[PDB]
Design a protein around this ligand. Sequence first.
Ligand SMILES: [Zn+2]
Ligand SMILES: [Zn+2]
Ligand SMILES: [Zn+2]
Ligand SMILES: [Zn+2]
Ligand SMILES: [Zn+2]
Ligand SMILES: [Zn+2]
Lengths: 155, 143, 252, 54, 23, 67, 227
Amino acid sequence: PRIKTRRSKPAPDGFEKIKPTLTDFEIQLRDAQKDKSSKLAAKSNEQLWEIMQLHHQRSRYIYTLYYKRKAISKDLYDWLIKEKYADKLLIAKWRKTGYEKLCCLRCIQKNETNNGSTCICRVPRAQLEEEARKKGTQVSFHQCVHCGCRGCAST
Amino acid sequence: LYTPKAEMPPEHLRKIINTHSDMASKMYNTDKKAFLGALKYLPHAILKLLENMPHPWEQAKEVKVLYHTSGAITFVNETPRVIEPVYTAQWSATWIAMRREKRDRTHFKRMRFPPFDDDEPPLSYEQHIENIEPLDPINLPLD
Amino acid sequence: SWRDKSAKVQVKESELPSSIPAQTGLTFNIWYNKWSQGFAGNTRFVSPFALQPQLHSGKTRGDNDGQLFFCLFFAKGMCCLGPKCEYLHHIPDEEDIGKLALRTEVLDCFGREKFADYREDMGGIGSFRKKNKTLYVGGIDGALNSKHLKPAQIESRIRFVFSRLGDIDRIRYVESKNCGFVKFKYQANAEFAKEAMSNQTLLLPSDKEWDDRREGTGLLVKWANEDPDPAAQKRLQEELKLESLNMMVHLI
Amino acid sequence: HHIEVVSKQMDPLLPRFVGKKARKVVAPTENDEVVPVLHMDGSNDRGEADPNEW
Amino acid sequence: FTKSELKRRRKTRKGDGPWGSWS
Amino acid sequence: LPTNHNKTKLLKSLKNTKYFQQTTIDWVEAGLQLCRQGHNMLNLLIHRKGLTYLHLDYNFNLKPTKT
Amino acid sequence: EINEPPPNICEQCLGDEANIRMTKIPQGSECKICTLPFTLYHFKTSKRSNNIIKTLICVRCATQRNICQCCMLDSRWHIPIQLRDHLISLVNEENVMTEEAKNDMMKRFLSLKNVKLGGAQITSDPSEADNIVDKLKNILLKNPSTKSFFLYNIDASIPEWKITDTVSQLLLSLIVNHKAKCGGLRFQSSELGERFVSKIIFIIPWSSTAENIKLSLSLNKLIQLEL
Ligand SMILES: [Zn+2]
Ligand SMILES: [Zn+2]
Ligand SMILES: [Zn+2]
Ligand SMILES: [Zn+2]
Ligand SMILES: [Zn+2]
Ligand SMILES: [Zn+2]
């Protein structure tokens, strides 16, 4: 959510319904932004994931409102996108088949990953289980580094 | 096998920056090295930032930005391009607006320099600025 | 048992201590995390925490995984990740030592690389060039806030402390040198203890200086040079020979 | 036994080559093979009369 | 694999949405 | 005359790697963040050198603390 | 310089996978021996194995010792370098050491030399190794419920772990001093003590040519006490 200028087209009619929902998200983000001086590394990353997951949830909310629930108007949605309450790219990915669930965009860039391949969270849990069984071990991981993703839930 | 970068949540970046003010652990030991490395490119970053100075008619200019995962640097990736005649028009309007202001105002308070004292740190964009609304920019009122 | 229960948190990250020790100097150095403009007085102090192993030890993320390394902060008794930690949380045993026996030649049970030489003190993590299992235990005078105890009392307390953390090959207190020599069953165990009782207190609740435990200077657990004593040298040699016979028969 | 080598791209902030630090290093010569130094002459009259002048 | 098995098994995750607990 | 062969820019190069991400940040935010970043950088450098007695002021006006 | 030498990694170490994917950071660390830049190689042994294996030492160092670059063990026998040097010293010779110079400059210098160390000359050529092996082979051929005992006649060489394990097999706490041999054993319960005693170099009273033994004990004890 950006800052209201003269160049900001004001929010259309149906925004008054949703404001308090995404307001909460905003508040959370504010809470999630501060020097919570985690000496630890893993926990520090955890905080970051809290922001990431929160972002996902907010965007996911707007996506739901637009597409699954089919409630809010198109203009309103557009406005929201422009203001960036919800990430557009993420939504686009969601709309595409296979990524119906998707933590975030960073988990599907094969360039960034040292092995030219997606984030392990994208591997469906069942597959991982199968692999583990074959090997003998259990699910080695619980959440990837890029975001707090205990499975990315393609299924 | 390519795809574009992730338009990340800027909140993430903010969080990272917040984290790297109280830096004093073996956690982010290599991030300090990262910071040192970034001095190479800090002048480049500066240039980009000054390149996308919001012109005096832009109230609150957003911009795309690359930033190190450890928040050791914050580039201003967007190139600040403009339709030349349009640009001239904008500056002309600000030229006349500014001139008008000069005309009307009996005294004209300038900013004291530098703006902040050595004790006062760089105030957080989220805590102070992001809440409060900006004043109206300069632009002569058009018919 | 440790395997019966999940590992409790040592201390929550709220309770954890900051990385700004003692202001030893006039100004703080950002890139070093040390202090500066003055090195007046000794740096070392006593650990606020200690590995109470039965109250703490347990399952982890690692015990699911087969992470082969133990938690330094477990040994120190200050791990802020309890069951969510990747590094393990229990006393090393024959099963786990055996499990990591390949890699542990090159590096510690805390998964950090050993070096060519001991750090001149014999103080830091061991050299790879020696397979030492023997910790020198200095600073007992400091570890008990100048408590005039008996040598027997000392050695017994020491025994109580290190026997808890690993299987002992032998211990012997030296009155004439005011120190210990605490040979362990395994190198992993030795490593574990050497951190687990570094900067710790030999004091107990029964002792009167219990609330002054923090204020002194902790145990100086370092590594031990082999004794000049030919009484043990011979034994060592014999052991080496025996081991050699094992491996040599194993080659064919 | 077979394996795939890779070069992981690293952060272009951190030093590219962490190792190199301008060490002073003394060289061992490694002249393991011996080599002669082999001049053919034997001057007595001029070779002994000269040093008195030289 | 039956798609109802995945339906029953994706509610076993104690958290909602992307972060599941999975014990 | 600008040389043409070098068509791998700095930002482009950086974009190629994983260690950078991109966001839409307000220019003021970018500025403030870059002052903070720059300050941290220079202090890190100075401390690294060892000379902690050179106090950077937040206004980038360097001066020594002690004589 | 050019990446002329290849990495010298052994099998056991590396793990039983037909194809692993390792990475090479060139000029990627100072080694653990000679403080000298080298191409650091590293890999997870399996994909989902958490422990990376990084090549600790430099290739020249590895060659010099004739060892693995990750294990620090001989590439042939997969055993500690010192131990193998001892073995070699024992068979065929009297003295074979591999002295690393513990001074930071000299170590570098030593590393630079293309010359094998003591044991490395044996283990490099497989014929010689085989010969050494065969030579080695040739060379080869009443219960008052005390819960607290005081054990005596303890072999000087025996460790406490052996003792306690033996006790467990015959089944707690234990105190031993190898000077005195006043093995101040104590059980976690008296019932356990009873169990132990009923289940029975094991000379064992229950305090809370044996004569000469007592004397030997005596003198040793006295000496211990003086210490
Ligand atoms: Zn993600
Ligand atoms: Zn992921
Ligand atoms: Zn994901
Ligand atoms: Zn832990
Ligand atoms: Zn190896
Ligand atoms: Zn080396």
